[PDB]
Amino acid sequence: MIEKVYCQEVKPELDGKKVRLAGWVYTNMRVGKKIFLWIRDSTGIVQAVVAKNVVGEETFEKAKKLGRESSVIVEGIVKADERAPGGAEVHVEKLEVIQAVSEFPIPENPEQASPELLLDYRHLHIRTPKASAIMKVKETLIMAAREWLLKDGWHEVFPPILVTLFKLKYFDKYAYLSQSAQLYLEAAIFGLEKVWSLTPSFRAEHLTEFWHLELEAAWMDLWDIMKVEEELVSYMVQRTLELRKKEIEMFRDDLTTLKNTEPPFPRISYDEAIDILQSKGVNVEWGDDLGADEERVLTEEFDRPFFVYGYPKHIKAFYMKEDPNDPRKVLASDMLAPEGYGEIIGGSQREDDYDKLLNRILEEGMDPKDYEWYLDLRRYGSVPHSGFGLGVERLVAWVLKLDHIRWAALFPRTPARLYP
Amino acid sequence: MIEKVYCQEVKPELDGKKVRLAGWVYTNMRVGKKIFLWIRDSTGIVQAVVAKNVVGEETFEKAKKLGRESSVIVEGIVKADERAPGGAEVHVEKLEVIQAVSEFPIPENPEQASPELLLDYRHLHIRTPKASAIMKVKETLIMAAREWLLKDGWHEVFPPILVTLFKLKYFDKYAYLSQSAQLYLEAAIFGLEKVWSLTPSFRAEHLTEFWHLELEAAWMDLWDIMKVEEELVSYMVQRTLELRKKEIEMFRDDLTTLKNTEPPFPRISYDEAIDILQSKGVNVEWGDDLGADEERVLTEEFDRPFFVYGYPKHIKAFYMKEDPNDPRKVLASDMLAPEGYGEIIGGSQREDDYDKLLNRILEEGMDPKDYEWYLDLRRYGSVPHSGFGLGVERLVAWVLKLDHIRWAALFPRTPARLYP
């Protein structure tokens, strides 16, 4: 048990006290006759002052050789000094060099490098301040979702990843990698009523692997689930603004759209969306899908997340409930982030009528035999119900205005990239 | 928005108040001239009394046809009555039948059925009281782990599932399904120091898919990580005893070993383990693996979780640190549950010396080229570090004394079973 003092703990009120730092060399500079090592750990950076006449010639010479990412244990006495970072520095008595490094492959400022170099060295890139900040924002957004979910009475479940799309050999059968836990959450609402899961989902056609936060609720219609989505997203964003302002300010000059993320979110129908896009000069016809690029133009009209609802039936999945007021449409909505980010949540009310569902399965050239367990849910005490899925990395990318979603994944998976 | 009163809320102090129940028929029995419907929801069961002269003949005849799992909305007035369940029943004014059911495939007492029938109908089985109870115990054990992890200063990360073992085609390459996030958590401790993840892991040789709670920490040796493991497991079990006593009592006559789960856990060396097993008449030689069945006999000596530490190098994975006092051994330990359950956690101190690690990789007929990023971690500011993985379903199976681990999975995956 290395009993360490974290960098964030090194404060002017510790003046005259001994501390033990454990971390990595951030910078090494000679200042006067002395060596100033800035030591990084997970909480911050502290200035450790190494004086030849205190530590001796052998240690002083070792200290000169410590490049970026050298691992070190440092013991010394805190000195309050307004001119040091944090207003306190450490006057080094003992320096233990675990491993001297002089050729760390990630540049001092990593965004000087080619993104391809950074990704080939992803395992080293994630330790740097900005990449690390994204991971802290990610865990906080997720912690906040779990707070909200517990408070609001939702039950966490752990649905299957292997399903009967990536294909793999599975003993005497074949298995696919799940793209969504939804159908299994629908089975679970019959016992638990309000359920959620957080699972990796896979896309074999953009990350090919991503984190999927999904909710499903008995008794709720489309309008009810849209209230859930805006309440959940608002709490996640507000709680993260509260806790991670420092990290978010590394990525954003302007926090306005985040600050604006409180209920009620603006709501437009798909019909109004087509109107907005045609009125800005976009060649889209009613019934057409809104892909990435039409979504981008739509988001220009908004300064916070917003909903689009009431989609044409045939651009949405087989399981969606028809709008009973206009059977040409389904009771589906997506939540799009502003500033060009586009869809972060897709959800719907689900079809709860056995015959209507069987019929959609047939119409779509699917085999009702493969979906028998799914159809069972409309046979044994069917109830109205709705749910949705949020893309975690999509949300993080909007929150930090990232230029590619891959930076929101610890080790991103894309069609080109499986490594490290 | 069906604005419902949950079954657990129906209490004698609501005497004379209107409530709306939404749920499923648990039982239907005629008592005198009246129909008593017991209505299940996610929180409990309430007795709803349907009287012909209150609801009318048409509703009364509909009520007679309601078998198990009929979905219903019930409005009525609470009446405090010591003889009804919960001491309060609902006198029905309005009964809305969403879907009458008379042939639910899961028997009234599901453990009358063949386990194979229950699994073929897993999507319906999970709604029943006991299967549901396991899921509530599971989410609580996990919630408790997250409480402990946050309090103790660990950072949550979201490591990769696809790695360069199940095999799949991945565009122009092949990918494998991860069996453990460990090597990626080792990369992440350089930025975050104390990290954890909860991911599905896969075993292609017992579930083939399971939930893996894994921790990794800079600066910690084997003895330090064993303290973490016993503190984490104790909090998870004590917090779950606190919250889920009702659920656990469904499965256990005796809570003693759970109550005994507090630090310090007993610790024996692998050498003492071999001694214990030989002294009970088991044919095991030093250097031999302890498989399922030797572990079972070992657990007889213990009344709470216990550690076995200091394994022969060649029964453990390539990445483990040699015991510097006896290089024939590695600094590995497993935590075994009592009562025959056996291993719930496997962990170790990791090798932090570049040459020793390179050498183990060679000795094991592996190609150091494939592990270059892993070896990088011993090149760029290596630090001592340790970690471990806990099997969530294994822990749940011990906690509830389950006769098969598959019952702890929402939708279990085994070599024989991919469905539903």
Give the DSSP per-residue string, B146-189. Answer: HHHHHHTTPEE----SEE---EEEETTEEEEE-S-SHHHHHHHH
Shortest CB distance from B155 goes to which of A2, A24, A136?
Answer: A136
Give CA separation, A240 vs A136, A252, A308, in Å: 10, 14, 25
Q: Which of A118, A173, A190 to mutate to test the interface with B (most CBs of B within 10 A)?
A: A190
| Closest residue in chain A to residue B174, using alpha carbons only | A418
For A46, the token pair is 């502290």
Note whether A166 contacts B166, CB cutoff 8 Å: no
Nearest-10 crossing angle of helices B392-399, B222-248? 50
Q: Which of A42, A154, A199, A216 to mutate to test the interface with B (most CBs of B within 10 A)?
A: A42
Shortest CB distance from A132 goes to which of B142, B191, B381?
Answer: B191
User: How many residues make up chain B in this entry?
Assistant: 420
Domains detected in chain A:
1-104 (2.40.50.140), 105-420 (3.30.930.10)
Task: Yes or no: say if A97 and A62 are a contact pair by the CB < 8 Å rule.
Answer: yes
Handedness of CA A214, A219, A223, A227 (dihedral sign): negative
Q: Is B286 helix (H, G, I), strand (E, B) or coil?
A: coil
| Residue A173 touches partner B, C-beta closer than 8 Å | yes
In the DSSP assignment, the letter for residue A14 is G
* Residue for token pair 């290089």: B327
B235: left (phi over 0), alpha (psi -120 to 50) or beta: alpha
| Residue A215 touches partner B, C-beta closer than 8 Å | no
* Residue for token pair 């040091």: A84
Note whether A123 contacts B69, CB cutoff 8 Å: no
For A56, the token pair is 């001796």
Considering only CB atoms, which chain A residues are within 8 Å of B142? 156
In the DSSP assignment, the letter for residue B350 is B
| Residue A96 touches partner B, C-beta closer than 8 Å | no
From B142's Cα to the closest Cα of chain A, the distance in A is 9
Note whether A380 contacts B104, CB cutoff 8 Å: yes
Considering only CB atoms, which chain A residues are within 8 Å of B184? 123, 410-411
DSSP B372-400: HHHHHTTTSS---EEEEEEEHHHHHHHHT
Considering only CB atoms, which chain B residues are within 8 Å of A208? 162, 170
Backbone dihedral angles phi then psi of residue A181, each to the nearest 5 degrees? -85, 0
Amino acid type, B369: K
Nearest CA to B262 out of B241, B283, B291 is that of B241
For A316, other C-beta atoms within 10 Å of its C-beta total: 18
* HSE value, Cβ hemisphere, 13 Å, CA-based, for A379: 12
Note whether A382 contacts B1, CB cutoff 8 Å: no
Q: Is B78 helix (H, G, I), strand (E, B) or coil?
A: strand
E-strand spans in B60-137?
71-80, 88-99
| Residue B243 touches partner A, C-beta closer than 8 Å | no
Note whether B194 contacts A42, CB cutoff 8 Å: yes
A401 Cβ contact partners less than 8 Å away, ≥ 6 residues apart: A251, A252, A339
Rounded to the nearest angstrom, the gap between the alpha carbon of residue B375 and the centroid of all alpha carbons in its chain is 33
| Residue A220 touches partner B, C-beta closer than 8 Å | yes
What technique solved it? X-ray
From A208's Cα to the closest Cα of chain B, the distance in A is 9
| Residue B165 touches partner A, C-beta closer than 8 Å | no
| Residue A168 touches partner B, C-beta closer than 8 Å | yes
Handedness of CA A146, A149, A155, A161 (dihedral sign): negative
Torsion angle defined by CA atoms of residues A375, A380, A382 and A386, in that order, rounded to the nearest 10 degrees: -60
Note whether B224 contacts A1, CB cutoff 8 Å: yes
How many beta-carbon pairs under 8 angstroms link A with B?
246
Note whether B218 contacts A22, CB cutoff 8 Å: yes
From B277's Cα to the closest Cα of chain A, the distance in A is 32
Shortest CB distance from A164 goes to which of B24, B136, B419?
Answer: B419
Q: Is the peptide bond before A160 cis (omega within 30 degrees of 0)?
A: no
Resolution for this PDB entry, in angstroms = 2.0
